[PDB]
Design a protein around this ligand. Structure first.
Ligand SMILES: OCc1ccccc1O[C@@H]1O[C@H](CO)[C@@H](O)[C@H](O)[C@H]1O
Ligand SMILES: OCc1ccccc1O
Ligand SMILES: [Cl-]
Ligand SMILES: [Cl-]
Ligand code: NA
Length: 472
């Protein structure tokens, strides 16, 4: 039993638009912040790589559907490129080519018995909106609403699973370094908090929009996908446990407390620590933006499910480190990795499968067991089809998730592996491979070929169980 998927549980795979599509300026698509980063700042990216072509999924979407069908995916999570649909960011111009492209993909998926799950925003903000300041500028909440309306109107008759945002904890970091994630702005501890604030507002507007303009007719569900690492106390002390709770509240709670709790608002520890630190460093005003009571009420409850992106764990101990100002410094935890944990091709990603079960339990307890869809989980290497490390990563993480479900009563409802194919891994370019299908980036045809992990995941999807040879 502990090795069998619940009957209704949905299994599939995931991608993101900039990471796979290419066709960056084709047929009316406008520029986004990743076009800008990779074109203007190739020194920020391994190999000076760009997403200009990537997997060429703009042209090759039927091949993506073919491999999804071979895999036996029940669900395909993909994102929509804002600037492909609204080239100017604002809703004055709708690019019919972008409408047609996503309709073609959606229709191809449905004709092959695969359910679309659509992420509205996976990091590719139109440059015209970044030029207003991007996420730190609250005007983007209304712009996000208007973008979502175009998506619901055009696609919501066929798409019944939506995520507003993906991994805002990561993309807010684009406002915390001059050389980092797009738009590569150096406002740590100030502009990243403003970005989060706008994102939360935007998410809430999009959810209310669905309720007001679309839900009765379309009958779908709207969530948000939050990334979070498990943080294991470095020792059993109460103080180290306190530091790990700080980590959860500063990383997951920042987004989830306003939306998923009865109280709403930011976590108290976030408000209090940033207030104190801001005062101590001479600011008149806290660096943390505030919600009014009316805003707290508007934002809380804006969810039909919680998306989780889970990859790894850290060790946390009591203390403070990091630059002043920064969110890491504000969080009051000293973070490390255990040298004993298996490594990947990504410096930040160690293999700690039991951390997944711990995280799922933390979420269950903090948020009253919301329905949780694992929207990303996966592993990097540098290449190879005999990807034993990735196979082990998946089988162990899925075992841990199944224990969370069956032993711990966590309401996990679906899982999409990150990623369907090797793709453009942001600042790492094509150097880090997260796919279950390999892609030859030197071959203009970008053929997709299955790795061992794709074969094992197909076996899991077909049998609906962890195969005996992978059991403890
Ligand atoms: O790297 C950012 C990141 C860190 C920890 C948890 C989730 C994350 O974010 C996810 O990670 C994937 C692998 O890096 C990216 O390819 C996905 O686009 C991103 O959504
Ligand atoms: O987040 C990186 C970092 C910054 C300053 C000091 C120590 C650190 O690990
Ligand atoms: Cl101890
Ligand atoms: Cl066997
Ligand atoms: Na329209």
């Amino acid at each position: 039993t502990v090795y069998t998927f619940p009957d209704e549980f949905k299994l599939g795979a995931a991608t993101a638009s900039y990471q796979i599509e290419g066709a960056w300026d084709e047929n009316g698509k406008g520029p986004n912040i990743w076009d800008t980063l990779t074109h203007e700042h190739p020194d920020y990216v391994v190999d000076g790589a760009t997403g200009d072509i990537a997997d060429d999924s703009y042209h090759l979407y039927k091949e993506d559907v073919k491999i999804l069908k071979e895999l036996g995916a029940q669900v395909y999570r993909f994102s929509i490129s804002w600037a492909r649909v609204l080239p100017e960011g604002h809703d004055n111009i709708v690019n019919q080519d972008g409408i047609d492209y996503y309709n073609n993909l959606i229709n191809e998926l449905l004709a092959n018995g695969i359910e679309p799950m659509v992420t509205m925003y996976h990091w590719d903000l139109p440059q015209a909106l970044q030029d207003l300041g991007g996420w730190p500028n609250l005007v983007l909440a209304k712009y996000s609403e208007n973008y979502a309306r175009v998506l619901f109107k055009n696609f919501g008759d066929r798409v019944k699973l939506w995520l507003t945002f993906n991994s805002p904890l990561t993309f807010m970091d684009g406002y915390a370094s001059e050389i980092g994630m797009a738009p590569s702005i150096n406002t740590p501890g100030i502009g990243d908090y403003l970005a989060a604030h706008t994102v939360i507002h935007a998410h809430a507007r999009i959810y209310h929009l669905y309720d007001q303009e679309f839900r009765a007719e379309q009958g779908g569900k709207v969530g948000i996908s939050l990334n979070i690492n498990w943080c294991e106390p470095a020792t059993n002390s109460a103080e180290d446990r306190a530091s790990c709770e700080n980590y959860q509240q500063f990383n997951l709670g920042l987004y989830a407390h306003p939306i998923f709790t009865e109280e709403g608002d930011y976590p108290a520890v976030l408000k209090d620590r940033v207030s104190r630190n801001s005062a101590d460093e001479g600011y008149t005003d806290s660096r943390l933006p505030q919600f009014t009571a009316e805003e707290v009420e508007y934002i809380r409850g804006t969810h039909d499910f919680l998306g989780i992106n889970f990859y790894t764990a850290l060790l946390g101990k009591s203390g403070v480190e990091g630059y002043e100002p920064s969110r890491y410094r504000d969080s009051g935890v000293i973070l490390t990795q255990d040298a004993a944990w298996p490594i990947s091709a990504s410096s930040w990603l160690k293999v700690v499968p039991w951390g997944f079960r711990k995280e799922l339990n933390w979420i269950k307890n903090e948020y009253n067991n919301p329905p949780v869809f694992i929207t990303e989980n996966g592993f990097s290497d540098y290449g190879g089809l005999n990807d034993t490390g990735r196979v082990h990563y998946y089988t162990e993480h899925l075992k841990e998730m199944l224990k969370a479900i069956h032993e711990d009563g966590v309401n996990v409802i679906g899982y999409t592996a990150w990623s369907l194919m090797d793709n453009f891994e942001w600042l790492r370019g094509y150097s880090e491979k997260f796919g279950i299908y390999a892609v030859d980036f030197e071959d203009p045809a970008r053929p997709r070929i299955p790795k061992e992990s794709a074969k094992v995941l197909a076996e899991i999807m077909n049998t609906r169980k962890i195969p005996e040879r992978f059991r403890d």
